[PDB]
Every structure is written in C-alpha cells, then in structure tokens.
UniProtKB/Swiss-Prot annotation, chains A, B:
Record-given protein name: DNA mismatch repair protein MutL
Residue numbers of the full-length protein present here: 325 to 425 of 425
Lineage: Bacteria, Pseudomonadati, Aquificota, Aquificia, Aquificales
Superkingdom: Bacteria
Homology family: Belongs to the DNA mismatch repair MutL/HexB family.
Organism of derivation: Aquifex aeolicus (strain VF5)
Role this protein plays: This protein is involved in the repair of mismatches in DNA. It is required for dam-dependent methyl-directed DNA mismatch repair. May act as a 'molecular matchmaker', a protein that promotes the formation of a stable complex between two or more DNA-binding proteins in an ATP-dependent manner without itself being part of a final effector complex.
C-alpha cells in the first residue's frame, strides 16, 4: 500500500478499511495483529493468543498504529498460518461501475 | 438494501459507503441525487444540473438524508441515463478471503 493512504474506519468490529490511490483494503484486525506479534515473537501460538479478536471495537489511535505497522511488516500479505490478511478491491472497479473514469 | 443498515461515510468525496447484513454498497452521490430529483421533477436535465457533483464534501446529515431517500426510490438501481447508482460487494467475499465464515 502506498505511503499516502486514508483510513476509513472499522467494519463489523472485524476489518479496518484503508485505501491508497489504487485499492481499498479490508484488513483483518486479528490477522494483522497476529502477524505483527509473530514478526516480533517468532511464536505462532503466542502471537495468536495475545492478539485482538474479531468483534472487539478498536480506538482510532489503535487503528492508526496497526495500519502504520502493517506497511513495515516483512510479510504484510498473509498471517503465519497462510491466511490472507486483507481483501482488496481496485478502486477502478467501483468508479467504472458507475460510469466514471479512474 | 435492508432497512437495518450502517453508513460508513464518504469516499473520495464521490461515494457514500453503506452496508446491510448482505452487501457493502458504494453509492454515487451525484447519481443518487440525480435519481431523487428526477423522480420528483420528471426532468432529466434539470435533475442533473441541480444535483451535487463528485468532489463535494457532504455533511453527515445530508448523507443520512440521501441514503434514507435512496431506499424509497422507485428505481434505486440506475440513474435516468442508465448508469448504475452504486457498486456492491457481497460481504461474504471479504470475510471468505481472510478465512472467516459469513
Ligand atoms: Cl478472531
Ligand atoms: Cl497518531
Ligand atoms: Cl499511530
Ligand atoms: Cl459528478
Ligand atoms: Cl437524522
Ligand atoms: Cl435523515
Ligand atoms: Zn508457543
Ligand atoms: Zn490460534
Ligand atoms: Zn489466530
Ligand atoms: Zn499514533
Ligand atoms: Zn493466523
Ligand atoms: Zn429540462
Ligand atoms: Zn448532465
Ligand atoms: Zn448527471
Ligand atoms: Zn436527518
Ligand atoms: Zn445520469
């Protein structure tokens, strides 16, 4: 994700919505924290058990911290168990559907 | 869209993000206002020229009004020129990508 981005907020207390100029990302808060903790601790089970879970409301500050850290991870793409950390949609798919250039 | 929904906010001063239990919708603010005005005025060019344009910031109250009205339109799907008013993504596509049931 580009270093210029906009955080749109939380969805379903499960995903952080954040976009750059190319994509809107839906970032799984659990998988992201698990990856962050795994890269520090090198322990899959420990990283999992201490991380936030889906269904927990996060403060705006905590969300900012997580997204900033996400960009600097060695593997921002998949958790240590191989699950994709995020879903993404190209912004052009949204614009083009309604007839706008992007 | 179901009568129970959550407005997530504006994106790019162009789309209103709103979800129910099934889909996340990206609603084009211009096309929506144009449809609203067209259903009142029955005049395509007049409805277009008086409507908000992309790139205009909208207040939270104005966004609420538009989304409430959207649900009651005779045609909430396409503007009078035939363009889709919104893009939608099934929530299950987002959940399933990260390995979650939905
Ligand atoms: Cl979880
Ligand atoms: Cl900060
Ligand atoms: Cl921060
Ligand atoms: Cl426009
Ligand atoms: Cl109100
Ligand atoms: Cl209202
Ligand atoms: Zn362990
Ligand atoms: Zn686990
Ligand atoms: Zn886990
Ligand atoms: Zn901070
Ligand atoms: Zn995992
Ligand atoms: Zn006219
Ligand atoms: Zn026009
Ligand atoms: Zn128009
Ligand atoms: Zn109101
Ligand atoms: Zn139109």
């Amino acid at each position: 994700m580009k270093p210029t981005y906009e955080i749109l907020g939380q969805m379903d207390e499960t995903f952080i919505l954040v976009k750059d100029s190319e994509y809107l990302y839906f970032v799984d808060q659990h998988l992201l924290e698990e990856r962050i903790n795994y890269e520090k601790l090198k322990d899959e089970n420990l990283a999992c058990r201490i991380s936030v879970k889906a269904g927990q409301k996060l403060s705006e500050e905590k969300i900012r911290e997580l997204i900033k850290t996400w960009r600097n991870l060695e593997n921002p793409h998949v958790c240590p168990h191989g699950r994709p950390i995020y879903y993404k949609i190209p912004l052009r798919e949204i614009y083009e559907k309604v007839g706008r250039n992007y």
